[PDB]
């Protein structure tokens, strides 16, 4: 039986006031808040949970201000609503920018996307985990109040004919919903099912936030510059709790009387391995892209996925029968190309302007710099020899360096040569590259040591910029940016085929997944794929996509069967599995092979 009070946010800070008719107005001692919007609390923990829209983050801290920590730093835009589920110990938020309602543990771990399809603008958000339902206001073109089970399922639209609604607050005791309407300037209510819909107060100047407590509704008004109270049933008994307050963004009553009830998630997380989400009692959730195991309780990390970067983001996406997420990788500026190592699960990319090659885990916790200034263009990983092949735009060279950083050397150089795109084929011992010579571009092939050079194509080319290959079927794929098309041939050079020339605009990136060729289209802003079933769109309205890379499940036993896989086949520099099925050593351009046949 402690004190009951109100919390509100005002952009610069979050303040705390009593329900008393004109009492004190203090601020919660938080640090580094710029544009606070969405509020919520946790009584058992005594923690507050807020959303900054300038910082683009969701943070938490105790009421005394200690232990301030960012709970969600990535993939946000405008997180305008957010609620705390006290029984499951999960955080729910709604980003009006990304148009997504999401969930994670209170601490931030195991983030998942609940609803994202056919969603306009989720603003306000109220949870009732005792009953398994969540409620949110939608803004956008045709505003409405939607309800869905707190796992994402059973999504329906409760209140269809409303303006922009904002104070979304469940009277847990009386089983009613109260909200403000910005376009009608009124406060309205309903029952849990959306029906029995009558307005409480209708002559309001400019209302915004709202919370109900006992027999009163509390709202904020910008024109009145006030925090007002009224009888939650009649709209009468209308007095002012706070005046002379400029802009009162959202507001909620802080008492243990609100965060009450019980579900199965409260008793040791319901035995789920990650997330426990309420339903009309519970069901175990996984992190985004993870999959629920046979036991209905444990999760499994994605095995086969798709990676695509924009200018300053690297996103992951699954190829399931059932959305893209942002990988948390700091310090991205102009991501030119990506690649992936399945052995150590490390993500390699090349940043422009900074002129470096970088690597990090899918969680971004291994951030290490491979090559530093001279500027690289495209990269391809020999996963077997554990080398990364790359092209230098500045010095027109094909440099090769190890995964640790140690330099191996240069395999191909010469003036008039201008190597740009590269793709390695260690299984057959060759590299296929794009040589952008002045006035006459080419697609070329050489052995992984720079010997055995030949031109594969010279006509019907203008700006070939991406290369990919299906080694199993023995085919090579390339996208010409200038000619707006995708072509494929035998690795030999034979059978040149146009795949797509119709609705392409700016193809700059492509990879083979299974029997599909995915390609980026920067200008048309979309990912597409083709059955090598017909052309299917994968993801439209993608910002500034720059490179794509399909990552398949690498089985260890299968990897080790490669001759170079174990200790590089004795070779000090370059291992070549050529011809019949035997390794042969070779060296970069500044070292000649020695007597031992292994070193130089």
């Amino acid at each position: 039986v402690p004190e009951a009070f109100l919390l509100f946010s005002r952009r610069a800070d979050i303040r705390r006031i009593s329900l008393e008719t004109n009492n004190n107005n203090v601020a919660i001692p938080l640090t580094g808040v710029k544009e606070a919007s969405a509020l919520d609390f946790d009584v058992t923990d005594n923690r507050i949970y807020w959303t900054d829209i300038s910082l683009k983050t969701i943070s938490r801290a105790f009421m005394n201000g200690s232990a301030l920590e960012h709970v969600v730093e990535f993939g946000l835009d405008y997180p305008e609503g957010m609620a705390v589920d006290w029984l499951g110990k999960n955080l729910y938020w709604a980003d009006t920018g990304t148009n997504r309602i999401e969930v994670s543990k209170l601490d931030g771990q195991h983030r998942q996307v609940l609803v994202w399809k056919d969603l306009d603008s989720p603003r306000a958000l109220a949870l009732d985990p005792a009953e398994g339902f969540m409620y949110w206001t939608e803004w956008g073109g045709k505003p409405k109040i939607d309800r869905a089970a707190m796992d994402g399922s059973e999504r329906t639209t409760l209140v269809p004919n409303v303006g922009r609604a904002n104070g979304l607050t469940i009277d847990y005791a009386k089983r009613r919903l109260y909200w403000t309407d910005l376009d009608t300037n009124l406060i309205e209510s309903s029952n849990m099912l959306g029906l029995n819909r009558e307005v409480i107060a209708d002559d309001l100047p400019h209302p915004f936030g709202l919370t109900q407590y006992q027999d009163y509704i509390y709202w904020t008004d910008w024109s009145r510059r006030s925090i007002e109270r009224a009888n939650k049933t009649s709209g009468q008994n209308r007095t002012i709790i706070q005046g002379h307050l400029d802009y009162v963004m959202d507001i909620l009553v802080f008492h243990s009387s609100r965060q009450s009830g019980w579900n199965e998630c409260a008793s040791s997380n319901g035995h789920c391995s990650h997330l426990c989400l309420a339903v009309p009692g519970f069901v175990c959730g996984c992190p985004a892209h993870y999959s629920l195991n046979a036991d209905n309780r444990t999760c499994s990390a994605p095995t086969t996925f798709l990676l695509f970067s924009q200018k300053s983001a690297i996103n992951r996406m699954v190829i399931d029968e059932q959305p893209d997420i942002i990988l948390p990788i700091h310090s991205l500026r102009n991501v030119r190309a990506i690649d992936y190592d399945p052995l150590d699960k490390q993500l390699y990319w090349i940043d422009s302007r900074q002129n470096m090659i970088r690597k990090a885990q899918e969680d971004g916790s291994q951030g290490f710099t491979v090559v530093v200034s001279i500027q690289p263009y495209d990269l391809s990983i020999d996963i077997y020899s554990r080398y990364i092949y790359w092209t230098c735009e500045a010095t027109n060279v094909i440099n090769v360096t190890r995964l640790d950083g140690r330099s191996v050397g240069v395999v191909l150089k010469g003036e008039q040569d201008r190597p740009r795109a590269i793709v390695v084929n260690p299984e057959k011992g060759y590299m296929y590259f794009t040589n952008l010579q002045e006035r006459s571009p080419k697609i070329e092939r050489a052995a992984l040591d720079g010997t055995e050079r030949e031109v594969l194509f010279f006509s019907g080319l203008s700006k070939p910029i991406a290369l990919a290959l299906d080694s199993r079927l023995g085919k090579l794929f390339w996208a010409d940016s200038d000619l707006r098309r995708i072509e494929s041939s035998d690795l030999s050079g034979a059978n040149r085929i146009v795949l797509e020339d119709s609705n392409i605009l700016q193809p700059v990136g492509l990879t083979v997944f299974e029997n599909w060729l995915y390609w980026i289209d920067k200008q048309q802003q979309m990912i597409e794929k083709i059955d090598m079933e017909g052309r299917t769109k994968v993801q439209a309205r993608i910002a500034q996509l720059s490179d794509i890379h399909a990552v398949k499940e690498l089985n260890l036993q299968e990897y080790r069967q490669h001759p170079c896989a174990q200790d590089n086949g004795g070779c000090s520099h370059i291992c070549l599995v050529k011809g019949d099925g035997t390794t042969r050593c070779s060296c970069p351009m500044h070292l000649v092979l020695l007597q031992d046949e292994l070193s130089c």
């Binding site: 952009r11 544009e35 919007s37 829209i53 300038s54 835009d77 405008y78 920018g97 073109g141 045709k142 505003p143 409303v162 303006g163 922009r164 910005l182 376009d183 009608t184 300037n185 009124l186 307005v199 209708d202 100047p205 400019h206 910008w222 024109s223 802009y247």
Partner: protein, 73 residues
């Protein structure tokens, strides 16, 4: 571009207007048919607006369907 920071409406590309979102202005899309549009009861509600909508489209007009207002023609 939709989402770009703007100061004037001419900073924004075709089909877009410059609208105040929170304590900054961003390029928002212009309202097409049937989409709800703001009708300010008092003058200065316009000024107070921190979540402003764009105006209606090329051949469209903002009128009524306590009801609400949509882009008609």
């Amino acid at each position: 571009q939709e989402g770009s920071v703007c100061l004037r409406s001419s900073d924004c590309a075709s089909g877009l207007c410059c609208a105040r979102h929170f304590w900054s202005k961003i390029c928002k899309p212009v309202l097409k048919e049937g989409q709800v549009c703001t009708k300010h009861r008092r003058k200065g509600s316009h000024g107070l607006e921190i979540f402003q909508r764009c105006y209606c489209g090329e051949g469209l007009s903002c009128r009524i369907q306590s009801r609400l207002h949509t882009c008609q023609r």
